Amino acid sequence: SAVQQKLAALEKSSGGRLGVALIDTADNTQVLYRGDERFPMCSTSKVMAAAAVLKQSETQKQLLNQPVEIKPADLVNYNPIAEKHVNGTMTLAELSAAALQYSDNTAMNKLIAQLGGPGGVTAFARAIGDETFRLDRTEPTLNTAIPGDPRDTTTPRAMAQTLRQLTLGHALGETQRAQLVTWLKGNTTGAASIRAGLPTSWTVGDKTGSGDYGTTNDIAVIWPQGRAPLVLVTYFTQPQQNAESRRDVLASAARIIAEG
Ligand SMILES: CCN1CCN(C(=O)N[C@@H](C(=O)N[C@H](C(=O)O)[C@@H]2N[C@@H](C(=O)O)C(C)(C)S2)c2ccccc2)C(=O)C1=O
């Protein structure tokens, strides 16, 4: 189609590998570019960890208020929120918000521990019908993004469908779904990614991700004014282990998609 030629041209100009999946919920049509190729998820995996804990709270009603201790040994490479609470506690609600809105890696590792390890996060994906998602490691090594390594990857198509289920579908209870949407809408790291390619009046909730090999990701749910919402996943990775992030590529892909 027209959009796919423009995405192919964008990919060629960037020197990397681009994966795009759009779901238009108005008629359930999809637009895919390398939709079935695996990409390193990096921090976009945090949405699945937060959703898995939300699912647990449907039965354990007070789980989100449970205090979790933050020790100096818990800190990893990027902990903007957890560092403000060392030798104190954060609730599972606060850790989920930190993981999602600030991409806090200590918060992610606590969520993984709550679920019993990476296998517990992956299990939740399987339980909602995602047979592609796999989480294999904790932070920060899940971001190595080595070419061809299947660990900690998903495909654009699978992540788009799963993100739709979590935010617009009924994979979660009503209160949990609204909480997830609220968290995504308050993301602080996405201003230069998908958001930058879309009209300023559109409401976006997103989760970015970045890692080695210049890996630059963003997954988003989009509420256009007076129109059915869209789900957009943009994954991008590069051949050089030390390549710079290319958030502009994600913005350009979103702009190309929004022209339709
Ligand atoms: C060999 C082990 N290893 C493999 C590579 N690696 C990473 O790729 N860490 C990455 C990391 O920890 N990224 C953080 C994360 O995993 O939420 C934050 N998420 C990014 C995002 O949402 O776009 C951020 C840029 C807001 S930082 C990282 C990416 C770019 C620049 C610095 C750090 C590591 O930190 C690491 O220790």
Side-chain angles (χ1 to χ4, degrees):
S1 76
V3 181
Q4 274 172 354
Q5 292 191 11
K6 282 188 171 181
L7 288 173
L10 173 69
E11 184 182 55
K12 184 174 175 187
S13 75
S14 73
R17 185 170 60 102
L18 179 71
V20 179
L22 169 90
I23 302 168
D24 183 2
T25 65
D27 54 0
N28 295 7
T29 53
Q30 299 184 357
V31 171
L32 301 166
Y33 187 79
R34 304 194 187 273
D36 296 314
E37 298 189 22
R38 278 186 179 274
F39 288 82
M41 285 183 290
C42 301
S43 276
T44 65
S45 60
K46 290 168 178 156
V47 177
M48 195 74 79
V53 171
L54 286 171
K55 166 62 62 179
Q56 287 187 326
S57 75
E58 293 177 22
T59 309
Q60 317 181 51
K61 294 299 198 302
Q62 308 295 268
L63 180 68
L64 285 194
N65 303 129
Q66 181 186 111
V68 178
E69 195 172 9
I70 309 294
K71 305 297 281 247
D74 291 323
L75 301 177
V76 282
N77 65 321
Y78 186 68
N79 348 279
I81 306 301
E83 253 185 278
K84 304 178 192 296
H85 300 274
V86 177
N87 297 122
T89 60
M90 298 174 63
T91 68
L92 278 172
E94 291 165 340
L95 293 160
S96 301
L100 292 177
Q101 300 182 327
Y102 294 86
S103 216
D104 189 299
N105 280 347
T106 299
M108 172 60 155
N109 276 357
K110 293 295 194 178
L111 299 181
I112 297 175
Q114 165 69 23
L115 302 160
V121 183
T122 299
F124 173 72
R126 300 290 179 276
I128 65 168
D130 189 332
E131 295 171 314
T132 304
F133 177 97
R134 52 182 292 178
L135 195 69
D136 295 277
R137 291 169 291 173
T138 58
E139 299 284 357
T141 62
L142 67 86
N143 300 297
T144 51
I146 291 157
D149 183 358
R151 294 177 298 178
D152 308 303
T153 60
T154 194
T155 67
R157 177 206 292 269
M159 184 61 93
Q161 299 177 151
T162 288
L163 187 61
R164 181 201 177 150
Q165 290 199 231
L166 292 180
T167 57
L168 305 169
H170 296 264
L172 304 169
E174 301 93 320
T175 61
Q176 291 73 27
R177 175 182 64 168
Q179 182 64 86
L180 179 62
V181 167
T182 289
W183 282 337
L184 294 178
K185 287 181 180 178
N187 181 35
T188 73
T189 64
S193 301
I194 285 171
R195 288 173 198 256
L198 301 180
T200 48
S201 66
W202 291 11
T203 305
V204 184
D206 80 296
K207 178 74 196 82
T208 57
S210 66
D212 281 352
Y213 286 87
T215 296
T216 315
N217 305 331
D218 199 10
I219 66 180
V221 181
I222 306 162
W223 292 267
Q225 302 236 13
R227 197 215 182 277
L230 316 163
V231 176
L232 179 60
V233 169
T234 55
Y235 285 158
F236 182 74
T237 198
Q238 301 181 68
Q240 302 95 351
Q241 187 171 24
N242 46 14
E244 316 168 82
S245 299
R246 292 293 305 274
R247 295 173 184 90
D248 61 299
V249 170
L250 309 191
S252 293
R255 187 175 298 102
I256 287 161
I257 296 289
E259 294 171 3

